[PDB]
Design an enzyme around this catalytic site. Structure first.
Site, PDB file in Angstrom:
ATOM      1  N   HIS A 113      46.825  70.221  24.772  1.00 20.60           N
ATOM      2  CA  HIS A 113      47.689  69.470  25.680  1.00 20.60           C
ATOM      3  C   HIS A 113      48.301  70.469  26.651  1.00 20.60           C
ATOM      4  O   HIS A 113      49.336  71.079  26.381  1.00 20.60           O
ATOM      5  CB  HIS A 113      48.756  68.707  24.908  1.00 20.60           C
ATOM      6  CG  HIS A 113      48.209  67.662  23.987  1.00 20.60           C
ATOM      7  ND1 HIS A 113      47.868  66.397  24.416  1.00 20.60           N
ATOM      8  CD2 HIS A 113      47.947  67.692  22.659  1.00 20.60           C
ATOM      9  CE1 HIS A 113      47.418  65.695  23.392  1.00 20.60           C
ATOM     10  NE2 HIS A 113      47.454  66.457  22.314  1.00 20.60           N
ATOM     11  N   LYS A 155      50.692  57.830  18.772  1.00 17.96           N
ATOM     12  CA  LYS A 155      49.765  56.941  18.086  1.00 17.96           C
ATOM     13  C   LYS A 155      50.430  55.660  17.603  1.00 17.96           C
ATOM     14  O   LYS A 155      49.729  54.758  17.134  1.00 17.96           O
ATOM     15  CB  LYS A 155      49.120  57.663  16.904  1.00 17.96           C
ATOM     16  CG  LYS A 155      48.149  58.755  17.308  1.00 17.96           C
ATOM     17  CD  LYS A 155      47.583  59.466  16.094  1.00 17.96           C
ATOM     18  CE  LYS A 155      46.737  60.657  16.503  1.00 17.96           C
ATOM     19  NZ  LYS A 155      45.483  60.231  17.181  1.00 17.96           N
ATOM     20  N   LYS A 191      44.964  71.626  19.485  1.00 16.36           N
ATOM     21  CA  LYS A 191      44.322  70.865  18.424  1.00 16.36           C
ATOM     22  C   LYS A 191      43.592  71.809  17.481  1.00 16.36           C
ATOM     23  O   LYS A 191      42.773  72.626  17.912  1.00 16.36           O
ATOM     24  CB  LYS A 191      43.348  69.845  19.009  1.00 16.36           C
ATOM     25  CG  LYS A 191      42.694  68.952  17.972  1.00 16.36           C
ATOM     26  CD  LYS A 191      41.739  67.962  18.615  1.00 16.36           C
ATOM     27  CE  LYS A 191      41.194  66.980  17.594  1.00 16.36           C
ATOM     28  NZ  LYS A 191      40.331  67.651  16.583  1.00 16.36           N
ATOM     29  N   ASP A 251      49.532  47.831  -9.331  1.00 15.32           N
ATOM     30  CA  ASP A 251      48.290  47.091  -9.170  1.00 15.32           C
ATOM     31  C   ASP A 251      47.763  47.305  -7.759  1.00 15.32           C
ATOM     32  O   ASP A 251      48.522  47.625  -6.843  1.00 15.32           O
ATOM     33  CB  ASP A 251      48.486  45.593  -9.436  1.00 15.32           C
ATOM     34  CG  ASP A 251      47.195  44.899  -9.799  1.00 15.32           C
ATOM     35  OD1 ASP A 251      46.236  45.606 -10.167  1.00 15.32           O
ATOM     36  OD2 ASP A 251      47.133  43.655  -9.720  1.00 15.32           O
ATOM     37  N   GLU A 311      46.454  50.980 -14.746  1.00 16.66           N
ATOM     38  CA  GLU A 311      45.368  50.218 -15.345  1.00 16.66           C
ATOM     39  C   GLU A 311      44.180  51.144 -15.561  1.00 16.66           C
ATOM     40  O   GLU A 311      43.798  51.891 -14.655  1.00 16.66           O
ATOM     41  CB  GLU A 311      44.984  49.009 -14.474  1.00 16.66           C
ATOM     42  CG  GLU A 311      44.313  49.332 -13.146  1.00 16.66           C
ATOM     43  CD  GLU A 311      45.306  49.628 -12.039  1.00 16.66           C
ATOM     44  OE1 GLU A 311      46.490  49.881 -12.348  1.00 16.66           O
ATOM     45  OE2 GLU A 311      44.902  49.606 -10.858  1.00 16.66           O
ATOM     46  N   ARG A 322      45.170  31.638  -6.952  1.00 13.37           N
ATOM     47  CA  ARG A 322      45.239  32.679  -5.932  1.00 13.37           C
ATOM     48  C   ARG A 322      44.588  32.166  -4.655  1.00 13.37           C
ATOM     49  O   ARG A 322      43.365  32.198  -4.509  1.00 13.37           O
ATOM     50  CB  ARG A 322      44.556  33.948  -6.427  1.00 13.37           C
ATOM     51  CG  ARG A 322      44.857  35.181  -5.595  1.00 13.37           C
ATOM     52  CD  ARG A 322      44.788  36.443  -6.442  1.00 13.37           C
ATOM     53  NE  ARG A 322      45.309  37.612  -5.744  1.00 13.37           N
ATOM     54  CZ  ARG A 322      44.720  38.198  -4.710  1.00 13.37           C
ATOM     55  NH1 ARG A 322      43.569  37.759  -4.230  1.00 13.37           N
ATOM     56  NH2 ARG A 322      45.300  39.253  -4.147  1.00 13.37           N
ATOM     57  N   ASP A 349      49.547  39.375  -4.717  1.00 14.68           N
ATOM     58  CA  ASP A 349      49.498  40.765  -5.155  1.00 14.68           C
ATOM     59  C   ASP A 349      50.688  41.098  -6.045  1.00 14.68           C
ATOM     60  O   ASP A 349      50.603  41.982  -6.905  1.00 14.68           O
ATOM     61  CB  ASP A 349      49.455  41.692  -3.943  1.00 14.68           C
ATOM     62  CG  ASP A 349      48.332  41.347  -2.988  1.00 14.68           C
ATOM     63  OD1 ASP A 349      47.321  40.771  -3.440  1.00 14.68           O
ATOM     64  OD2 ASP A 349      48.457  41.655  -1.783  1.00 14.68           O
TER      65      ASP A 349
END
EC number: 3.1.21.1
Length: 1240
Positions: free
Chosen positions: A733, A742, A793, A841, A926, A1159, A1196
């Site tokens: 830049h 962004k 960058k 979850d 889980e 659901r 959810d």
RNA sequence: AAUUUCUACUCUUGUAGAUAGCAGA
DNA sequence: TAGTGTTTGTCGTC
DNA sequence: GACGACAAAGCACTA
């Protein structure tokens, strides 16, 4: 027991990494001496020597295999018996017989046995020992076995440096080991080639017996070539000849008796392999093989069981249809009373056996042949249409990358198709077909590897993280910080004004030269130098230097009086004979007292031994200064374990003494010292804000508290690295340009990737084209900034950088490894029933969702983790990335998605640990072993989330919060330790300390008020008879005029054939077709009750598009059309059956489909609610659109709630259990029975 | 678009979180 | 007849 | 019977 007491339990080792910035002119001195270039050459020399050593690695293996002479008759009999009887006894007999033969080969390499004469057996051990030692370069191993001058010059390049092959030694141990591992030579001989050779002998004698003229014909072929001139054709097909088929030259001759980095690199190599497929005509050969299947005998063309489910999903409705069709036809041909045991035998047989193609066609119908024909020609046409399509000139444009991927997909598609057929010789394969198939196949195997190499090139980043280790001509550089090894290692650290400097002393003019750093008064400005004092271990160093050295061992052998030690001793030590005799079930050890039982002899001998150690410490030249008076007298020491654990921390110590700046600067000036500042962006001039965890570990290591009382230890064996620059495309830049954020004005919703580039170009007025319609709409929402200073960058890799990988040990005062960590956690949990839970979850509209519950089960807090640090990771960012992959379907977009998911999950563990410590809770994940999640979920199953659980376990091993003071628990000096050490994915089960793993399935599609689940599998309704039989199993369906609902009573002892085999509690249910009404939520928004989103549009495509549906309104309308009167409240199902209207029955079942579907999701309209079909004990059907905080907010939310609820079932059994153990998983029926009883 | 570097980012010449390296797949 | 540039020591688990 | 962690002890080189 306290939650804050879970600290300082086991040692954890972490290695920090930093960047070294040359100070003064140390970079100039390094360049002048050429250290980096010399070490760069050593990197190339190490890589170029990789196959040279591997070559001298075969010589020894080839030489050992030349003397192998074994009797293979026993191995053949074990193979025959296992093929004869398929019992587990003959399998274990073969497994042991193979292990015996593998060891027989292994004893030739390193037998250490009695079978081979030591004259030969011991000679191999002297080679195998230093095959992983310096001998490789000594020429000693080659002296046991001729080197050329350049090879000899390459060996000496690693003189006093053979530890560079440390990891390589492990890679070569992975090649042998003589185990079932396929990587080994004994396994290749016993379990790969011999069954092939044994089969060759059987094929030979069968042909010669039937056609004896073939014997002389085979003999002529052997004589006409010249192979095995001293061996007849019958002997090469006899067992004793296999001993001469153990080397490659003999294997090659045996097989010949039978057979007679850049962009254009991927284009030139692929097109070379691509043009090779035309000359071999592998497409024409493949198209001819699949055309043979229309007329040849299909009872000998076998499909692999590992691919049967994949083929079923590619050619039929589901993966189930093929395995099920074969099941029904095999049950159709059983004998006598078909018990349920005979059915389970048919099931288990279909899991691990190859099915011939004829049995598949006879069981699935003629529509599979049409699917097989269409799929085969579809794949063959794409591969045929890709071999003649030319590759582009470059990979600069994405349109040119796409056609390269498209042709590779066609090549991999044909490669996938060929792997459908069984390769094992256990089946009766066709003679010609198996030979022609295995041929074009052996040719397509590198396509897969080539395809993977190509995809990684697209995924690759424009950097080059590749680097090489800097030695500075010292094999022990930074191998130890001790002051007495100042010259030996030459690596020390300096601290000055909060900036940490690394100082390494080079070999001055090729020789070691110590630097006389004079300790200067602290008042004068200058660097502070580390003075590191360390005695490794009392158990191993004390006997080495006092009673097990060469002087006293020999003296006590040939002279029976105590001897005085003077060297390395302030005052001579009178070591006496008995204590050495004690150290010669060792004496003064727990075993000696346990077995002999001479307790009186024990306590006196230990008192003398402990006193002797205390005598040694006060007399040794380096341990005399440390204050050991804190040690207790020897009378009250139980054993060596407590004494050494107490003596060890007193030996290690770090102190700092000021060194004048003039000496340090002049040392760098002349070049005697190389100064390297440690830099990790937390020492920058503009730095402001909380630092990194690794910086805190570095800062906390040198804090005054840690020096006084050690909790972070600076381990030795530090490493230095140098990374060459990778400046190939610099983006920056420049001043005067206009930055583009962004994120939009709300700094939370990211711009789409494609739109962001177009907007950025237009803001800088560089875009030649015009903006899109959506680009103009999003233009006012973006925020722009002027470039005050240039931002480069990827500035990390623009230039050359040094590095410093230094290892540190945390919780140094604890044990090496945890001792029954789960028992401690279970003890705390048992005494703390009020410990809250944390359920996590993977939702569909939320990447990671959380819900905390208490002992009673109420939801204390539920949150969606898709917005972390004022940034949306799912609602916007992942949606745009998913939109791009659905638009282009390239490799770069896939790589960005995976990197983003891992980066997002890194942010999640911070939220988990912050949440967990605040509640003092236990988090329930889980386990990935059970169940799977749909494609609509935002995280791939068992790919990224499995590594996510690894990070959570590792993070909680040494949990440190960066807003906490060091002195309190949870800080850098006293980290939290709430998880056991991670060992493997398999070994971790239902508990990993303060982590629980409950089965994923049957968690998110459950009514949270009644525990109800959809009890009917809808794959069992296909025909009118099934629909009628399903509908007639219900009790009664009637209109309630008072409420306007339909009550469909059901008893779980009905419709068993259509059920899932999980009855649970509540043997009866009341399915309610809720009357549709414009109910209002807590916010007052209008929503219609009972609304269901059904995707059924076509019989084959059941999710073409989401459609609104109201079970109550449609069923009233359906009944009105049929003329059915139902306002009287009478039963409706019997009247439905008697009219026998096919359309009405289908609509009747399809509406039961919708009402049982809780659901309901719709991405476009942003609805993800869950609606209960059955009433609760209060008498109100659950509806998540009400937004009641006490119950899950959306679909959810329901899943994370029940994972936490599944955690309660683990602890509820834990509290009542007498033992400190947990169940090996939770059964689905047991979980359903528990939840259905609790919600009542 | 600036990082011991991984992700995301730019009020802040930097932010927030993660980060056990080396060797070999 | 010495400066100087790989070996050994184990305690407990395992 | 088999693993380690960093030191000081040895051990060979020339001298």
């Amino acid at each position: 027991t306290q939650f804050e007491g879970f600290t300082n339990l086991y040692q954890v080792s972490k290695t920090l990494r930093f960047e070294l910035i040359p100070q003064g002119k140390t970079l100039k001195h390094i360049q002048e001496q050429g250290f980096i270039e010399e070490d760069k050459a050593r990197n190339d020399h190490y890589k170029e020597l990789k196959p040279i050593i591997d070559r001298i690695y075969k010589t020894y293996a080839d030489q050992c295999l030349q003397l192998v002479q074994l009797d293979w008759e026993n191995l053949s009999a074990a193979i025959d018996s296992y093929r004869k009887e398929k019992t587990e006894e003959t399998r274990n007999a073969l497994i042991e017989e193979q292990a015996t033969y593998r060891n027989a080969i292994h004893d030739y390499f390193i037998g250490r046995t009695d079978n081979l004469t030591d004259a030969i057996n011991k000679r191999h051990a002297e080679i195998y020992k230093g095959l992983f030692k310096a001998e490789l370069f000594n020429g000693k191993v080659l002296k046991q076995l001729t080197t050329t001058e350049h090879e000899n010059a390459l060996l000496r390049s690693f003189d006093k440096f053979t530890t560079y092959f440390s990891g390589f030694y492990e890679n070569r141990k992975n090649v042998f080991s003589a185990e079932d591992i396929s990587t080994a030579i004994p396994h290749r001989i016993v379990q790969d080639n011999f069954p092939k050779f044994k089969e060759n002998c059987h094929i030979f004698t069968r042909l010669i017996t039937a056609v004896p003229s073939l014997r002389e014909h085979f003999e002529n072929v052997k004589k006409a070539i010249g192979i095995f001139v001293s061996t007849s054709i019958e002997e090469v097909f006899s067992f004793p000849f296999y001993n001469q088929l153990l080397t490659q030259t003999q294997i090659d001759l045996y097989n010949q008796l039978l057979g007679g980095k850049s962009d254009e690199e991927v284009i030139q190599s692929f097109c070379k392999y691509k043009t090779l497929l035309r000359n071999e005509n592998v497409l024409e050969t493949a198209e001819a093989l699949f055309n043979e299947l229309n007329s040849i005998d299909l009872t000998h063309i076998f499909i692999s069981h590992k691919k049967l489910e994949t083929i079923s999903s590619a050619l039929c409705d589901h993966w189930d249809t093929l395995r099920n069709a074969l099941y029904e036809r095999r049950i159709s041909e059983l004998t006598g009373k078909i018990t349920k045991s005979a059915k389970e035998k048919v099931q288990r047989s279909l899991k691990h056996e190859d099915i011939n193609l004829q049995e598949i066609i006879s069981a699935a119908g003629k529509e599979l042949s049409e699917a097989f024909k269409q799929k085969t020609s579809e794949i063959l046409s794409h591969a045929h249409a890709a071999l003649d399509q030319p590759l582009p000139t470059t990979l600069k444009k994405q349109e040119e990358k796409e056609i390269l991927k498209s042709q590779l997909d066609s090549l991999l598609g044909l490669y996938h198709l060929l792997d459908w057929f069984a390769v094992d010789e256990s089946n009766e394969v066709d003679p010609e077909f198996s030979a022609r198939l295995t041929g074009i196949k052996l040719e397509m195997e590198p396509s897969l590897s080539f395809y993977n190499k190509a995809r990684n090139y697209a995924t690759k980043k424009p950097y080059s993280v590749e680097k090489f280790k800097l030695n500075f001509q010292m094999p022990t550089l930074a191998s130890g910080w001790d002051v007495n090894k100042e010259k030996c290692n030459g690596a020390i650290l300096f601290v000055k004004n909060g900036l940490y400097y690394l100082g390494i002393m080079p070999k001055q003019k090729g020789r070691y030269k110590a630097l006389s750093f004079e300790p200067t008064e602290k008042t004068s400005e200058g660097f502070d130098k580390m003075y590191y004092d360390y005695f490794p271990d009392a158990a191993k160093m004390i006997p080495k230097c006092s009673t097990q050295l060469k002087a006293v061992t020999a003296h006590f052998q040939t002279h029976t009086t105590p001897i005085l030690l003077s060297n390395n001793f302030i005052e001579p030590l009178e070591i006496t004979k008995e204590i050495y005799d004690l150290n010669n079930p060792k004496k003064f050890q727990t075993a000696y007292a346990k077995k002999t039982g001479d307790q009186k002899g024990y306590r006196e001998a230990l008192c003398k031994w402990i006193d002797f150690t205390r005598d040694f410490l006060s007399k040794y030249t380096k341990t005399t200064s440390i204050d050991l008076s804190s040690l207790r007298p020897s009378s009250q020491y139980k054993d060596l374990g407590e004494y050494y654990a107490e003596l060890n921390p007193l030996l290690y110590h770090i102190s700092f003494q000021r060194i004048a700046e003039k000496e340090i600067m002049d040392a760098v000036e002349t070049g005697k010292l190389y100064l390297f500042q440690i830099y990790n962006k937390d020492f920058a001039k503009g730095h402001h804000g909380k630092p990194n965890l690794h910086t805190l570990y570095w800062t906390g290591l040198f804090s005054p508290e840690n020096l006084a009382k050690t909790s972070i230890k600076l381990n030795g064996q530090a490493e230095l690295f140098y990374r060459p620059k990778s400046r190939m495309k610099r983006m920056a830049h420049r001043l005067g340009e206009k930055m583009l954020n962004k994120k939009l004005k709300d700094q939370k919703t990211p711009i789409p990737d494609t739109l962001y580039q177009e907007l950025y170009d237009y803001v800088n007025h560089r875009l030649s084209h015009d903006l899109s319609d959506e680009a103009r709409a999003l233009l006012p929402n973006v925020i722009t900034k002027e470039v005050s200073h240039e931002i480069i960058k990827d500035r990390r890799f623009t230039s050359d950088k040094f590095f410093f990988h230094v290892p540190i040990t945390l919780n140094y005062q604890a044990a090496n490894s945890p001792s029954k960590f789960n028992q401690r956690v279970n003890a705390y949990l048992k005494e703390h029933p009020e410990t809250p839970i944390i359920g996590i979850d993977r939702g569909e509209r939320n990447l990671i969702y959380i819900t905390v519950i208490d002992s009673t089960g109420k939801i204390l807090e539920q949150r969606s983790l898709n917005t972390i640090q004022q940034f949306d990771y799912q609602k916007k960012l992942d949606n745009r990335e998913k939109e791009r992959v659905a638009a282009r379907q390239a490799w770069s977009v896939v790589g960005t998605i995976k990197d983003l998911k891992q980066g997002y999950l890194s942010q999640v563990i911070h939220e988990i640990v912050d949440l967990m410590i605040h509640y003092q809770a236990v988090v329930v994940l889980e386990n990935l072993n059970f169940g799977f999640k749909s494609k609509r979920t935002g995280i791939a199953e068992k790919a990224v989330y499995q590594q996510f659980e690894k990070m959570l376990i590792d993070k909680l091993n040494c949990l440190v919060l960066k807003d906490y003071p060091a002195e309190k628990v949870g800080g850098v000096l006293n980290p939290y330790q709430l998880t056991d050490q991670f060992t493997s994915f398999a070994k971790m089960g239902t508990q990993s300390g303060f982590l629980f793993y409950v089965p994923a399935p049957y968690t998110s599609k459950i009514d949270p008020l009644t525990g109800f689940v959809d009890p009917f599998v809808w794959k069992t309704i296909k025909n009118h008879e099934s629909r009628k039989h399903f509908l007639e199993g219900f009790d009664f369906l009637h209109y309630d005029v008072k409420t306007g609902d339909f009550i469909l009573h059901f008893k779980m002892n009905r419709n068993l054939s259509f059920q899932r085999g999980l009855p649970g509690f509540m043997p009866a249910w009341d399915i309610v077709f809720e009357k549709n009404e414009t109910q209002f939520d807590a916010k007052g928004t209008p929503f219609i009750a009972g609304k269901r989103i059904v995707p059924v549009i076509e019989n084959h495509r059941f999710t073409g598009r989401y459609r609104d549906l109201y079970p109550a309104n449609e069923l009233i309308a359906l009944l009105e059309e049929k003329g059915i009167v139902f306002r009287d409240g009478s039963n409706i199902l019997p009247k439905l059956l008697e009219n026998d209207d096919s359309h009405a029955i289908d609509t009747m079942v399809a509406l039961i489909r919708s009402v049982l579907q809780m659901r309901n999701s719709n991405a476009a309209t942003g609805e993800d609610y869950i609606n209960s079909p059955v009433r609760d004990l209060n008498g109100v059907c659950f509806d998540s659109r009400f937004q009641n905080p006490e119950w899950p907010m959306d679909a959810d939310a329901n899943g994370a709630y029940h994972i936490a609820l599944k955690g309660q079932l683990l602890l509820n059994h834990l509290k009542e259990s007498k033992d400190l153990k947990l169940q090996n998983g939770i059964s689905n029926q047991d979980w359903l029975a528990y939840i259905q009883e609790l919600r009542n």
